[PDB]
């Protein structure tokens, strides 16, 4: 909907190179606000956004205590998985998991999320009702039976509906000057002939936030989406993003093409033409 | 704030 919080856990076993490594990052919408890495000298939770640093010392000690324990739990999970699939302790394996809550335009919990992957594939997932699971395979069903017996879905539903929502709001306020302030994209069209017959029109959008945006090339007001070449929205490095759309058009028809830009930061949807 | 405690896979 309007706002969200996410955590991204990555655990990788590395036989011979040491113990399984655990990394965690936290996002509010598209702003990373904290990180944890077990490979550090003396691992600690660390700020990745100035506004989170309003939290007292107790906050960071507490978070570190948690990510420290996750390090162990996932090492134990990597073992279990290896068991589930009958794999040697010689191969390297990864566990990934992303969970979090979504807010509506009015601070209400829209829906919750929790998914685990094994070697970059769907493994297990908490369903929309936050009371059931969807296992990907026979191995995942073993985890499910334990989690059903352990009542994990109930622990999450209480979190996604409770602490996750309270604290997401808490951050939106504490950092409203950067989280709720939308940065409109700077735009402009470019033209580049490919031959004597055709030419490329490219529509730019830069320095924008959040990352959610819609660049669509129209020919006579009709979206040429299937013909529009997009690139993955990318990080400018300053917390704002970049993107461009491109189309190959015939020479002389250039003026029948408009570029529309939709973004939370734009009062009204922009319309752009190549202006030689 | 992260999930307080992780369940074992």
């Amino acid at each position: 909907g309007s706002h969200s919080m996410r955590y991204f856990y990555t655990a990788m076993s590395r036989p011979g190179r040491g113990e399984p490594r655990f990394i965690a990052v936290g996002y509010v919408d598209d702003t990373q606000f904290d990180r944890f890495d077990s490979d550090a000298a003396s691992p600690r939770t660390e700020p990745r956004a100035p506004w989170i640093e309003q939290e007292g010392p107790e906050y960071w000690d507490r978070n570190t205590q948690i990510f420290k324990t996750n390090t162990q739990t996932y090492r134990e999970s990597l073992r279990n998985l290896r068991g589930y699939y009958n794999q040697s302790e010689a191969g390297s394996h990864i566990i990934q998991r992303m969970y979090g809550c979504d807010l509506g335009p009015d601070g209400r919990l829209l829906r919750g999320h929790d998914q685990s992957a094994y070697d970059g594939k769907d493994y297990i997932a908490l369903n929309e009702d936050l009371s059931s699971w969807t296992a990907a395979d026979t191995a995942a069903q073993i985890t499910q039976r334990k989690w059903e017996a352990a009542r994990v879905a109930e622990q999450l539903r209480a979190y996604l509906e409770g602490l996750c929502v309270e604290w997401l709001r808490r951050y939106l306020e504490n950092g409203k000057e950067t989280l709720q302030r939308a940065d409109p994209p700077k735009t402009h069209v470019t033209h580049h002939p490919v031959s004597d017959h055709e030419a490329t029109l490219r529509c730019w959008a830069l320095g924008f936030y959040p990352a959610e945006i819609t660049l669509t090339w129209q020919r006579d007001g009709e979206d040429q989406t299937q013909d529009t070449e997009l690139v993955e929205t990318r990080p400018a490095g300053d917390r704002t993003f970049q993107k461009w759309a491109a189309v190959v058009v015939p020479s002389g028809e250039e003026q029948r093409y408009t570029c529309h830009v939709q973004h939370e930061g734009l009062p009204k949807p922009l319309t752009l033409r190549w202006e030689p | 704030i992260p999930l307080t405690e992780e369940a074992e896979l």
């Epitope: 107790e58 507490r62 205590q65 948690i66 420290k68 324990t69 162990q72 739990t73 090492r75 134990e76 989690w147 352990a150 009542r151 994990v152 109930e154 622990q155 209480a158 409770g162 602490l163 604290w167 | 704030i1 307080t4 405690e5 992780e6 369940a7 074992e8």
Partner: T-cell receptor
Amino acid sequence: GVTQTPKFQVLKTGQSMTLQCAQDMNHNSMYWYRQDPGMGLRLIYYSASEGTTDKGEVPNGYNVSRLNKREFSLRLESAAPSQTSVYFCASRTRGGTLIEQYFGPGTRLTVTE
Amino acid sequence: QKVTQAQSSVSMPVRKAVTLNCLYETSWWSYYIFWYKQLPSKEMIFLIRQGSDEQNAKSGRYSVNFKKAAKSVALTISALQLEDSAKYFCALGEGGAQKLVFGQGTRLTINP
């Protein structure tokens, strides 16, 4: 479930001794509590897994070792009369809602001069 | 001071019901409360758990009055049997990997 030996013990001041604990339940978090005559329980050491041990409300005079996941041992080192107490081992699952700790029968320990 | 049980010992006629008080102190955003009952043999048996974000817990004859704001979590035992005679402990479990701080216990005596 969670077995603990010895169940009774007497010590002369300045003695070392080890209490043994093993949980047959496949739990992950283990604890060593100490209960004085009229008081309640207080944590000494605990461990989230093997190779990792943490304090500890009153860790002084005690060392500990999680030699593996099923077993968690405690030591007295230099027995002192003030260390007379009932030492409880504890085990519990992580994740989900059934996170209560399960105690062993206990170890009544008197230390005499 | 972290966990306080205001009654050192309480007497009750059989068949009735009794409430045992327990007040705690925590700055944690996630915790649990546990009620245990200790036998003369020192054996420590588990009774009921109360989550920080849970409805009032009820497990058979054991029920809990969770007053999150006042940080009060009094236990109530109904239909008092004579086995109920024991020492009852209220334990705070804040975590994480939760290291319990125990009340100092209440002595429950059921009269015949």
